[PDB]
Design a binder for this molecule. Structure first.
Ligand SMILES: NCc1ccc(Oc2cccnc2)o1
Lengths: 351, 18
């Protein structure tokens, strides 16, 4: 067969150890989820806006007593209510408090005032994958694989907790000072052991069964991994067009084309992730995540060494010191106004 | 090329969720 006796034994043991790890991690998550660190705004100096959204913004801050830098996501409670994202905001905080994994950003403090909600997390100084990818053009297959391996492990972890992620894309992946990935956004993540039905995500990364309004499951995240690996390795995503509706027609068609520089191993992996037939999609079969991890394209990947952060990264972002924001774009700076009247108190009582 | 088609899509910047 493909493996001789020593390699088959090694792989079986590895796969059993993963099960042992996940069972412990699930116990730890559930204890934190059931029995969940405040601070206040004047504990921090505000330095610079690192990124913006419809909710509010993310700012670099420095914690006054300790001198540590953090990234502070500020959400305007009234805008959250208007954008129908109360449950999403409360869920994101609950997830971030409860998870623990080397590629998931660490929430350090949270708090709220009359106007806003605040989530203070580790600062990840290396910037968005998105920026680096557009700047360099494309990543080599080894460079793409190093990142892809981290997403595979992170999804193996999240899915073990019954969490579906649902908004993978380069925009949502940050690079830390050692060149490893950090996932920070959980705005569409949901606990789903069974199926779920909401239309959500980003057009280029939507799985066909989401577009087709079916009940769907964690396999949508493995489709999205396909999209990400393709985009990292090509420099552009597999399905694009001027308008979303034309993207969707490409996604559901069952057709994908590849650059001539893609390896055959890469193309085989992507045809198995970008599989419109759920009964054939990798990550959704009886062998689960192991179909992905044991694929030829990942044959050089030492999964434990990636988890331990002992692999030399392909790319180490520029870092001139704590507080360096050079790997982030410039955004228009708006004041943080706090109303003298409490807004939306009942909606956000659990935050 | 396919890259040129990508540039023509106008979706080369940060993409919003739906
Ligand atoms: N959602 C991507 C994004 C926009 C702006 C940022 O900067 C961050 C966020 C969290 C930690 N470190 C840096 O991330």
């Amino acid at each position: 067969g493909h493996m001789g006796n020593a390699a088959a034994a090694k792989k079986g043991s590895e796969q059993e150890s993963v099960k042992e790890f996940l069972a412990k991690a699930k116990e730890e998550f559930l204890k934190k989820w059931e029995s969940p660190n405040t601070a206040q705004l004047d504990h921090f100096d505000r330095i610079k806006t690192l990124g913006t959204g419809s909710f509010g913004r993310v700012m670099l801050v420095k914690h006054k007593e300790t001198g540590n830098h953090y990234a502070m996501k500020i959400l305007d409670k009234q805008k959250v209510v208007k954008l129908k994202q109360i449950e999403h905001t409360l869920n994101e905080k609950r997830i971030l408090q409860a998870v623990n994994f080397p590629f998931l950003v660490k929430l350090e403090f949270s708090f709220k005032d009359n106007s806003n909600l605040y989530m203070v997390m580790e600062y990840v100084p290396g910037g968005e994958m998105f920026s680096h990818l557009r700047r360099i053009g494309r990543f080599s297959e080894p460079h793409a694989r190093f990142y892809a391996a981290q997403i595979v492990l992170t999804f193996e972890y999240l899915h073990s907790l019954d969490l579906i992620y649902r908004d993978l894309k380069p925009e949502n992946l940050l690079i830390d000072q050692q060149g490893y990935i950090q996932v920070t956004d959980f705005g569409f993540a949901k606990r789903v052991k069974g199926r779920t039905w909401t239309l959500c995500g980003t057009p280029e990364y939507l799985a066909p069964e989401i577009i087709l309004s079916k009940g769907y499951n964690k396999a949508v995240d493995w489709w999205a991994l396909g999209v990400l690996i393709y985009e990292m390795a090509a420099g552009y995503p597999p399905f694009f067009a001027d308008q979303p509706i034309q993207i969707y027609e490409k996604i559901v068609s069952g057709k994908v084309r590849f650059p001539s520089h893609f390896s055959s191993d890469l193309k085989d992996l992507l045809r198995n992730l970008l599989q419109v037939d759920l009964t054939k999609r990798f990550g959704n079969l009886k062998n689960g995540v192991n179909d992905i991890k044991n694929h030829k394209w990942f044959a050089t990947t030492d999964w434990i060494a990636i988890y331990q952060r002992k692999v030399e990264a392909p790319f180490i972002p520029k870092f001139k010191g704590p507080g360096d924001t050079s790997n982030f774009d410039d955004y228009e700076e708006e004041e943080i106004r706090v109303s003298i009247n409490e807004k939306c108190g009942k909606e956000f009582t659990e935050f | 090329t396919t890259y040129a088609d990508f540039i023509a899509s106008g979706r080369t910047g940060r993409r919003n969720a739906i």
